[PDB]
């Protein structure tokens, strides 16, 4: 048996970190965002 | 207007002066019928002011 000294567990919080690596863009779940201009064969106004 | 832009890479002044001189006798004609409909003569527009 080991009796250590340890922190408190009042004296201290566990924070969740969410970590990313870059910033997602616009039409990230869009695999062709192109396809709404390439389709318009009308014309836009 | 990727197509709308092609014809302007692929296109000559003497085909654009006809183009634009065509639309300026079909507003004329336009505007001479709403001449002839409401009168309008120096007359008219200055009875108007």
Do not use: W
């Not at chain 1, 990313?20 to 869009?30: D, I, S």
């Not at chain 2, 079909?26 to 108007?48: E, G, N, S, W």
Request: charged content about 20%; aromatic content about 6%.
């Amino acid at each position: 048996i080991k009796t250590a000294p340890v922190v408190p567990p009042t004296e201290q919080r566990d924070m969740v970190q969410e970590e990313r690596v870059g910033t997602p863009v616009k039409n990230a779940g869009n695999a062709n965002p192109a396809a709404d201009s390439d389709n318009a064969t009308e014309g836009v106004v | 207007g990727r197509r709308l832009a092609a014809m302007f890479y692929y296109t000559n002044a003497d085909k654009m002066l006809s183009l634009t001189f065509g639309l300026a006798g079909q507003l004329r004609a336009a505007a001479d019928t709403t001449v002839a409909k409401f009168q309008i003569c120096p007359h008219t527009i200055a009875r108007a002011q």
